[PDB]
UniProtKB/Swiss-Prot annotation, chain A:
Assembly with partners or alone: Interacts with snoRNA U3. Component of the ribosomal small subunit (SSU) processome composed of at least 40 protein subunits and snoRNA U3.
Compartments (UniProt record): Nucleus, Nucleolus
Further details from the record: Present with 2000 molecules/cell in log phase SD medium.
Protein name (database record): Probable ATP-dependent RNA helicase DHR1
Top-level taxon of origin: Eukaryota
Family: Belongs to the DEAD box helicase family. DEAH subfamily.
Curated annotation (Swiss-Prot), chain B:
Domain PINc: from-to ranges: 15-114
Species of provenance: Saccharomyces cerevisiae (strain ATCC 204508 / S288c) (Baker's yeast)
A GO term, aspect molecular function: RNA endonuclease activity
Shown residues within the full chain: 49 to 188 of 189
Cellular-component GO terms for this entry: nucleolus; nucleoplasm; small-subunit processome
Name this polypeptide is given: rRNA-processing protein FCF1
Domain of life: Eukaryota
Curated annotation (Swiss-Prot), chain C:
Protein known as: U3 small nucleolar RNA-associated protein 14
Gene designation per UniProt: UTP14
Function: Involved in nucleolar processing of pre-18S ribosomal RNA.
Self-association state and partner proteins as the record states: Interacts with snoRNA U3. Interacts with MPP10. Component of the ribosomal small subunit (SSU) processome composed of at least 40 protein subunits and snoRNA U3.
PTM-bearing positions, type Phosphoserine: 54-55
Family: Belongs to the UTP14 family.
Compartments it resides in: Nucleus, Nucleolus
Organism from which the protein derives: Saccharomyces cerevisiae (strain ATCC 204508 / S288c) (Baker's yeast)
Misc: Present with 1470 molecules/cell in log phase SD medium.
Domain of life: Eukaryota
Length: 439, 140, 113
RNA sequence: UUUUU
RNA sequence: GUCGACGUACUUCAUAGGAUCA
């Protein structure tokens, strides 16, 4: 028996299943004996089961896990036609298609599947295309140290030990690292990694044990932080000391920005509370546990029964202890099939509507309605070709689940007969504009 | 000590009556004088009293209610000081009656009337129809 | 110069534009059905709410609004319309009862502290 | 379960 | 004639709304 990770491409749900190993795998286990002397292999299954139920060889690695990183690398080779690449066993077309789509949403590839300048720029890093994009946008307001730490933490895996794997001490350590934000798993990761920087080398082991932190992973996170800061400094202009990783607390302005950079790499993994879209089907009460509040991921394939698309908060997230209603929209890293046949989502951080439209504006995930009309909302016309108006941005791609965001004031210009949104406008900016034409 | 079951044996003429903010509106609307209307209703000398909360409440009203503000500042209407931060007049009026049982409350808000009604021995005056009416005052 | 021609065209587009809003505004003006106007009003309140076009009311603003409501008592069933519907059994119907309750809840909002 | 520049 | 119209006198049906709690 072996516990394999099965990835359901259709819904993006990750499952761990205990199934029969392949015959070659069993043969390899039997080979462990006989290296130092004649040995015995006692198999706990009958030969009848072995000959019939055991697969000859386990499925190749390529056919089981995502290929977005590989497509980007090959596209950086100018291997435009990946389909005609002489693979040992070619990857499935569906997996390739989603890889291209995910890269396009990130801006790595254009609509014709050529590598963009950003696509080339991400391929220089040792990270997945998602995490690169986080590092790409980090240049603003000295947020780069925080994004590097967050990126390294997610790239290496969670250094946190879960409750199931293990009480007051556990929550006490959790309380310390959630202080930056009450709605972000990502900032919990950043809290630990940057907190370690002020731990002197001698006490580092005591810190990791005291906080239920996996010792090995954080050390690699430290190592991988240096390599990232090295590549950026070397290629932007290089010796990096442990002093370089020491960073102070983010400002409130920065924290909002980090949410935006994080959302940049996970623009395709935004989930909205179901009661917002379908209040009839998702009736939330004040008694309802936060862990049981349904959410709906963007671009989810519509089923006849909408409940099939519901996604719930993972037990491990800090939100389960939040004490108030969860945010309207949520970012999630991956989806796991819980024991109750309920999909669970690993939250990243909350995002507001207006920032979400701003980031998706540069992606293919935002469309604009017709101008709104009424008191307050009036299409101010500067000229026959340019105007100021309110529009309702629609988020998400009519076979999927897209939803409309809050209206946002925009500047539109008529280009080749079509109205194109140039820039967003604050409420004050639009009101002053409405006054200006009146005077 | 001033209350005999539900009968207040302390309130005696001349009466001291607290003027609520809305009382002045309907006094003006019905063309009823404050000083004489109370005299007719009770057949006694009445000492109208305006507190700081109602007085501040009136000033916030705006230019439209200038007449009410002028009547509120008539020299015959004595002023009552307040030693509390809150400016809500209804809460102030409920407070004073609880402390000392000698005041008539002149008001027309349904909500404030109910709260005063629960307090025993508080005569509650209102303006309705063509003149003032007093509810819980046996000497009438 | 030929720039003058450019000026006339820009005016011509602006004139053609103003007519279009006039025609649309004229037509929407004639439709005065309750259901139609009710749907438009509901959608407008969502957009203004969602976009937060309306500024938050300061505590002083709320106090002034509450003061006028107490001064007048304009949102109780003693008004001419409310008294007319109540006393003549027209509020037993669902629709006119909703308007009465809509009026009463709005009055209660201004009474909140 | 594994595991990677 | 269990007749039509009108006049008169009655009967009846359409009342719940918001907030909190379980
Ligand atoms: Zn007072």
């Amino acid at each position: 028996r072996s516990k394999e990770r099965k990835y359901n491409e259709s819904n993006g749900v990750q499952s761990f299943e205990v199934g029969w190993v392949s015959k070659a795998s069993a043969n390899q286990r039997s080979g462990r004996a006989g290296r130092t002397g004649p040995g015995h292999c006692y198999r706990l299954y009958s030969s009848a089961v072995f000959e019939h139920d055991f697969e000859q060889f386990s499925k190749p690695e390529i056919l089981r896990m995502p290929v977005e990183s590989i497509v980007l690398q090959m596209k950086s080779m100018a291997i435009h036609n990946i389909i005609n690449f002489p693979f040992p066993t070619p990857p499935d077309r569906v997996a390739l298609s989603k890889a291209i789509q995910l890269l396009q949403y990130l801006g790595a590839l254009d609509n014709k599947e050529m590598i963009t300048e950003d696509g080339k720029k991400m391929s220089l890093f040792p990270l997945s295309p998602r995490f690169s994009k986080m590092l790409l946008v980090s240049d603003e307001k000295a947020c780069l140290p925080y994004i590097v730490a967050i990126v390294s933490a997610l790239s290496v895996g969670d250094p946190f030990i879960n409750e199931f794997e293990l009480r007051s001490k556990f929550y006490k350590s959790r309380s310390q690292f959630s202080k930056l934000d009450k709605f972000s798993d990502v900032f919990r990761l950043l809290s630990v990694v940057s907190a370690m920087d002020y731990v002197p080398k001698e006490q580092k082991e005591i810190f990791m044990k005291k906080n239920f932190l996996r010792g090995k992973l954080m050390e690699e996170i430290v190592k991988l932080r240096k390599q990232l800061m090295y590549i950026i400094k070397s290629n932007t202009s290089v010796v990096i000391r442990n002093e370089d990783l020491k960073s102070d607390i983010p400002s409130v302005i920065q924290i909002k920005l980090l949410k935006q950079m994080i959302c940049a790499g996970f623009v395709d993994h935004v989930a909205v509370r179901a009661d917002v879209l379908f209040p009839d089907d998702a009736k939330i009460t004040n008694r309802t546990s936060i862990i049981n509040i349904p959410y709906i991921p963007v671009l989810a394939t519509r089923t006849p029964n909408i409940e099939d698309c519901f996604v719930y908060i993972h037990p491990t997230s800090i939100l389960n202890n939040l004490g108030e209603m969860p945010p309207k929209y949520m970012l999630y890293y991956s989806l796991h099939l819980g024991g109750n046949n309920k999909t669970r989502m690993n939250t990243l951080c909350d995002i507001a509507s207006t920032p979400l439209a701003n980031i998706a504006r540069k992606g293919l995930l935002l469309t604009y309605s017709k101008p709104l009309t009424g008191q307050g909302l009036k299409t101010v016309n500067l000229s026959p070709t340019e105007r100021y108006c309110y529009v309702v941005p629609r988020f998400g791609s009519d076979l999927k689940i897209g939803w409309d965001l809050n209206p946002i004031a925009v500047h539109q210009k008529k280009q080749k007969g079509q109205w194109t949104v140039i820039k967003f406008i604050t409420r004050k900016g639009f009101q002053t504009i409405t006054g200006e034409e009146k005077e | 000590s001033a209350l005999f079951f539900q009968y207040n044996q302390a309130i005696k003429p001349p009466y001291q009556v607290l003027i609520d903010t809305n009382f002045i509106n309907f006094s003006i609307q019905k063309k009823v004088d404050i000083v004489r209307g109370m005299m007719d209703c009770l057949l006694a000398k009445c000492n109208p009293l305006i507190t700081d909360c109602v007085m501040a409440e009136l000033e916030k009203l705006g230019p439209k209610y200038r007449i009410a503000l002028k009547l509120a500042r008539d020299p015959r209407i004595k002023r009552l000081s307040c030693s509390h931060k809150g400016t809500y007049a209804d809460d102030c009026l409920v407070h004073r009656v609880l402390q000392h049982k000698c005041y008539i409350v002149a008001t027309n808000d349904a909500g404030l009337k109910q709260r005063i009604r629960k307090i025993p021995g508080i005569p509650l005056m209102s303006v309705g129809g063509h003149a003032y009416v007093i509810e819980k005052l046996p000497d009438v | 110069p030929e720039e003058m021609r450019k000026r006339t065209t820009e005016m011509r587009l602006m004139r053609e534009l103003m007519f279009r809003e006039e025609r649309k505004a004229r037509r929407l003006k004639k439709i005065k059905s309750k259901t139609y106007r009710k749907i438009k009003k509901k959608e407008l309140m969502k957009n203004r709410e969602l976009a937060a076009v309306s500024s938050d009311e300061d505590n002083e603003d709320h106090d002034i609004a509450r003061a006028k409501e107490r001064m007048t008592l304009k949102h109780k069933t003693n008004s001419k319309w409310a008294k007319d519907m109540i006393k003549h059994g027209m509020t037993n119907d669902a629709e006119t009862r909703e308007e009465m309750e809509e009026m009463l809840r709005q009055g209660e909002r201004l009474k909140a502290k």
